[PDB]
Amino acid sequence: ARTVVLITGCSSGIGLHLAVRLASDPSQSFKVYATLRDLKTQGRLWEAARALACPPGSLETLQLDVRDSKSVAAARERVTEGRVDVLVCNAGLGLLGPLEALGEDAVASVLDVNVVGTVRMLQAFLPDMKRRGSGRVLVTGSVGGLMGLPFNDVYCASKFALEGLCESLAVLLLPFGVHLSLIECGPVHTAFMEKVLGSPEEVLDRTDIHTFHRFYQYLAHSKQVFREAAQNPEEVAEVFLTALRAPKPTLRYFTTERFLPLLRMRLDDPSGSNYVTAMHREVFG
């Protein structure tokens, strides 16, 4: 009867806010399974659930490690209703710093969670939706998935990957009645460092002095972009709802038009020369 929704990465940010937005919806039409990698981080979720007074049984927490298919299979199994009407692939890791300063482990982790982890969720949940000829999948994208940002080389690699992943799939799913949609967010309030980097001593030991200088410049710039452009996760969460209510969802939703013009010069110069120059002066003056 209710729309069963399964969301990944609900310890914070978009995922946590989206879970509570849905479970507490005045209409009581959503049954929400908020998954989290470690159950010890579930308190912020329950505290938000109490604030928005989610009624008993509208929200459940599941431990789900997207880097593990047995974990993915186990949470799938936990879906009491026997079907998921809306799957939200939200789990994600950030990674910021000079390429040469990133640990191999850190690099592999990011793609394993952002990319292979989404592939796992889709392998486990699409089969059933295709069968029923129904279901919606929302994947949280990023402006960094649409244009390259310096010092976010690997993060962007993973976000650009999701675009390719979802776009290829969408061309196939079109006739199965299964809708997949990317929600492209610009910066969103509630974070730290920006994503994840190392101490300046760590980064200095791992890079040249000039790249180290550039990094600082990028960080100062990003901090200002967040200050003047960051959105409340409440406003971003509502975009996920606009997408899931669309009788005919598009492949892509943007939570803001703020980056569209920059996305435009990128789109209008296939060679990438205009964007690289524009983004260079935009960050490094």
Ligand X SMILES: NC(=O)c1ccc[n+]([C@@H]2O[C@H](COP(=O)([O-])OP(=O)(O)OC[C@H]3O[C@@H](n4cnc5c(N)ncnc54)[C@H](OP(=O)(O)O)[C@@H]3O)[C@@H](O)[C@H]2O)c1
> Which residue ranges make up the annotated binding site for substrate?
142
The angle that helices 153-173 and 104-111 make with each other, rounded to 10 degrees, is 20
Q: Which residue has the tokens 């296939």?
A: 270
The single residue among 28, 41, 168, 242 that binds ligand X, judged by CB under 6 A, is 41
What is the number of alpha carbons within 13 Å of residue 207 lying toward its C-beta? 23
Is 142 a binding residue for ligand X by CB under 6 A? The answer is: yes
Q: Is the dihedral of CA 80, 56, 90, 139 positive or negative?
A: positive
We find the least distance from the C-beta atom of residue 167 to ligand EST, in angstroms, to be 13
What x/- string results for residues 149 through 188 when contact with ligand EST is judged by CB under 6 A? Answer: x------------------------------------xx-
Q: Is 155 a catalytic residue?
A: yes
Amino acid at 263: L
Q: Which residue has the tokens 């390259």?
A: 148
Binding partner selected for residue 166 from ligand X, ligand EST, its own copies, none, CB under the kind-specific 5 to 8 Å limit: its own copies
The single residue among 3, 12, 134, 274 that binds ligand X, judged by CB under 6 A, is 12
Q: Residues 280-283: contacts with CB within 8 Å, 24+ apart?
A: 280/150, 282/221, 283/149, 283/150, 283/217, 283/218, 283/221
What x/- string results for residues 83 through 112 when contact with ligand X is judged by CB under 6 A? Answer: -------xxxx-------------------
* Cα–Cα distance measured from residue 124 to residue 126, given in angstroms and rounded to the nearest whole number: 6
Is 97 a binding residue for ligand EST by CB under 6 A? The answer is: no
Q: Which residues are catalytic?
A: 155
* Residues forming the site for ligand EST (CB under 6 A): 142-144, 149, 186-187, 194, 222, 225, 259, 282-283
